Nucleic acid binder design. Structure first.
Length: 341
RNA sequence: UGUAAAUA
């Protein structure tokens, strides 16, 4: 199976092997773990000539290396460190196989690297090959990385077909493990005409989203990167429920982002909500203090409050200081207090 | 003291 040259090479019988010396053997070395490493080592610091010898032997069977556990790296190097004519020629090799490669464990790495390095003409061609399979890729463990890369590298206007697919399914997709990632990429890179319809569906399901294992990240993302108007719509869903949400494993992360990225007014009102609100005998603030998740919200409130309001929070915390020691998470608030005293 | 992505 292995040629004598590859066999002997593996037994380390060529300590000084040069790229030039494996002529006629590139495909086989490429498909071998050490040989492939060999080729990659030798490529970054190889003359364009030596690079072209290697290329002549991988072009025709390029696909075969794209979907091979060791061969895909050799192809990728050509997309990075290759030449503007070698990259184009490999794009040709991918043509008609974009879908199949984007779902492939190894090919999808080649599709990704190619999108970063090819011209927009070749990008827009790769993209269009996913026309009709947007959701299949978004949900696939390889494909969703390719769709993310498209959104990051390709002109937003050529991505309109992905948006079309997401319309009406934003809630479902935001609660999906890969879809929430793709949603986040769309908010970062897409045009208003595209992000707006998607933001409308997010606002419509904020309540459910903030408590969802994956949805909470999409809402956090908006708070961290969104327009003030989108932030405020979200902040308005949290107001009235600060105490409850801050005790939730997922939504508590969102409440924190609210506290952190809300406008001054919105922030003051959120912190005041639990300074003023009672939970039975004592403040909401106090119940939060003892909670495995809420204590983090309390601390974040202490962090970002305006100095005058920090005083208010301190005053509410002060009377419980001794009894805080008895509670597992209360203890952690004590730690935060040292800072401020 | 608390939550999410892929190859030797």
């Amino acid at each position: 199976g292995r040629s004598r040259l590859l066999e002997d090479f593996r037994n380390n019988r060529y300590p000084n092997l040069q790229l030039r010396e494996i002529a006629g053997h590139i495909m086989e070395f490429s498909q071998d773990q050490h040989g492939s490493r060999f080729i990659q080592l030798k490529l970054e610091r190889a003359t364009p000539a030596e690079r072209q010898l290697v290329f002549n032997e991988i072009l025709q069977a390029a696909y075969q290396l794209m979907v091979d556990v060791f061969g895909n790296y050799v192809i990728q190097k050509f997309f990075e460190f290759g030449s503007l004519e070698q990259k184009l020629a490999l794009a040709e090799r991918i043509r008609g196989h974009v879908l199949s490669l984007a779902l492939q464990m190894y090919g999808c790495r080649v599709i990704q690297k190619a999108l970063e390095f090819i011209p927009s003409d070749q990008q827009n061609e790769m993209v269009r090959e996913l026309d009709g399979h947007v959701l299949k890729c978004v949900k696939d463990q390889n494909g969703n990385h390719v769709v993310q890369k498209c959104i990051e590298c390709v002109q937003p206007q050529s991505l309109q077909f992905i948006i079309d697919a997401f319309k009406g399914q934003v809630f479902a997709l935001s609660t999906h493990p890969y879809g929430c990632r793709v949603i986040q990429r769309i908010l970062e890179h897409c045009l208003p005409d595209q992000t707006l319809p998607i933001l409308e569906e997010l606002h419509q399901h904020t309540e459910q989203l903030v408590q969802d294992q994956y949805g909470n990240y999409v809402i956090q993302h908006v708070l961290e990167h969104g327009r003030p108007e989108d932030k405020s719509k979200i902040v308005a869903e949290i107001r009235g429920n600060v105490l409850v949400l801050s005790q939730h494993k997922f939504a508590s992360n969102v409440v924190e982002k609210c506290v952190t990225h809300a406008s001054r007014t919105e922030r003051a009102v959120l912190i005041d909500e639990v300074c003023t609100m009672n939970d039975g005998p004592h403040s909401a603030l106090y119940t939060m203090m003892k909670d495995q998740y809420a204590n983090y919200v309390v601390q974040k409130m202490i962090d970002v409050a305006e100095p005058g309001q920090r005083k208010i929070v301190m005053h509410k915390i002060r009377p419980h200081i001794a009894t805080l020691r008895k509670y597992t998470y209360g203890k952690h608030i004590l730690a935060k207090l040292e800072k401020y005293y």
